[PDB]
Design a protein around this ligand. Structure first.
Ligand code: BEF
Ligand code: BEF
Ligand SMILES: [Mg+2]
Ligand SMILES: [Mg+2]
Lengths: 128, 177, 177, 128
């Protein structure tokens, strides 16, 4: 994928946004921005430029599933890739986010190997 | 023990505690707070797991890195004494009587060092990923304190009413999709 | 709404809750458990500090090291490309037409590298102490889960009765001793 | 001090025994042993050889103050140096351990600088 691709890492825990930032830095993606919740995330997606989003599920103000359906329902961001990186593991929630239009799903704790594995599986089906 | 007489017997006091006992048992039993104080008392058996979880993750992600720092020091060490070893060898060749022989052996040995640096430098740089990655425990250990603080809040109002893998996740999405 | 008649009014039901209410208020008030359920409800205001403490230490000793790993990588990086830079320079001098000039400049530049290694290697080895030392939070964050689990145990039996610097430490020892 | 000096690091938390072991390794003392409580500590002090003890206060089976008075009262270990490294900070406990016969007192969290500072202040007054 184009190394200038703009990413939006959304999660309520600092520890976890920084751990994903670095992981992306190792992969060559240095144009990354942070968000602490669904709302703040949409606020930045409003500014424009983003082409890839990695989000968590459990977050205040507007959870991940709400942010997923919001992007999938907005006419100007509907196809924006969205990779889920959360702690939820109930087949019922995996499905739920799956049907909501999730690009990919990564359960925490995850390996650096697993993130790259699902970041590419997403670039593969979207011919990015 | 002479004054007075008609004084409560040991039984009469106990007899009374029993009345207040049944009275209690039944105000709760009828107002349905026999319920409440039982949803909070059976939450304790759980929160003890969540607080013993946070200590699991803690004693782990704390021994994990402590293990990298353990294995990264040997390489920073070795790689540093060698650079210092050679910096010396050279200063001497260049100060002592010219000896073309030693001049060769010195070039050979530093081209070797130059070759080993990567092995050490990489490894050490791979342990820093161990230390990083491995710390994820905060976010995790953090959301459990998120929840376990919400529980300690119910157990609070319940005494206020009464007193005022990643391989399976793909087997799923891929087998149903 | 025709059959029967002598049926409890809205007031009569409320009238009754009140009786069970006072009855409760008073069984507790007399058996002295008005006390108990009040020592446990006022423990909650505390444990929320201890669980917000464990998250302080967590978000710290987790950003601390994450900061070392942050600053140690640049040096493992630089020190490694240079060794690789020179290992190349040499392979070429030794394969290409002899050029005594370059032979000098190559020796000068690697004796330089040999000199910088320590600066990097040390620093990186000093950040590994940051990462180590800094992790002390487990023992600390651990003894608070030690205590906070003992408290959640009282709050449990209280619903079982009812339901069954280093600069100051020296100013001290040295000013009194 | 003689670099072969045998140390006994006593504390109920692994994290904290390993952090002190290393700190001592940097200072050159490689003959160090661990203990998880007062009793197990006395069990090893029974085996013999120890010349320096660093202990914590709060520990199961036999706390630190109990281990301090036990050594100070035993005729064969009475003068054994004992440096306290704990979390207790109430002037009342500092005094208590002070009067019990504590060689030194270090409050957690402590700096590597502080440990060496009090390890030497102990070797100084005992002419070690
Ligand atoms: F907070 Be995420 F759902 F792990
Ligand atoms: F457990 Be020690 F008293 F810090
Ligand atoms: Mg979250
Ligand atoms: Mg302790």
């Amino acid at each position: 994928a184009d190394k200038e691709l703009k990413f939006l890492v959304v999660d309520d825990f600092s520890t976890m946004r920084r751990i994903v930032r670095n992981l992306l830095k190792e992969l060559g993606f240095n144009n990354v921005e942070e968000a602490e919740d669904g709302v703040d995330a949409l606020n930045k997606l409003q500014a424009g430029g983003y082409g890839f989003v990695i989000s968590d599920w459990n977050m205040p103000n507007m959870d991940g599933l709400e942010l997923l359906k919001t992007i999938r329902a907005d006419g100007a961001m509907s196809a924006l890739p969205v990779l889920m990186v959360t702690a939820e593991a109930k087949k019922e929630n995996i499905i739920a986010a799956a049907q909501a239009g999730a690009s990919g799903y990564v359960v925490k704790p995850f390996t650096a190997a697993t993130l790259e594995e699902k970041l590419n599986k997403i670039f593969e089906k979207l011919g990015m | 023990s002479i004054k007075p007489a008609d004084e409560h017997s040991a039984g009469d006091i106990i007899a009374r505690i029993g009345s207040l006992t049944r009275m209690l048992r039944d105000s709760l039993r009828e107002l349905g707070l026999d319920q409440a104080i039982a949803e909070a008392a059976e939450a304790i058996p759980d929160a003890r797991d969540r607080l013993y979880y946070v200590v699991q993750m803690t004693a782990q992600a704390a021994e994990r890195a402590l293990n990298s720092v353990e294995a990264s020091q040997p390489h920073q060490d070795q790689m540093e004494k060698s650079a210092k070893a050679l910096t010396q060898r050279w200063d001497d060749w260049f100060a002592d009587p010219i000896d073309l022989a030693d001049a060769r052996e010195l070039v050979t040995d530093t081209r070797q060092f130059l070759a080993d640096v990567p092995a050490h430098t990489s490894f050490t740089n791979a342990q820093l990923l161990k230390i990083m990655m491995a710390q994820d425990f905060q976010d995790l250990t953090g959301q459990v304190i998120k929840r376990m603080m919400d529980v300690i809040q119910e157990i609070e109002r319940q005494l206020l009413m009464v007193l005022l893998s990643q391989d399976q996740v793909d087997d799923l999405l891929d087998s149903l999709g």
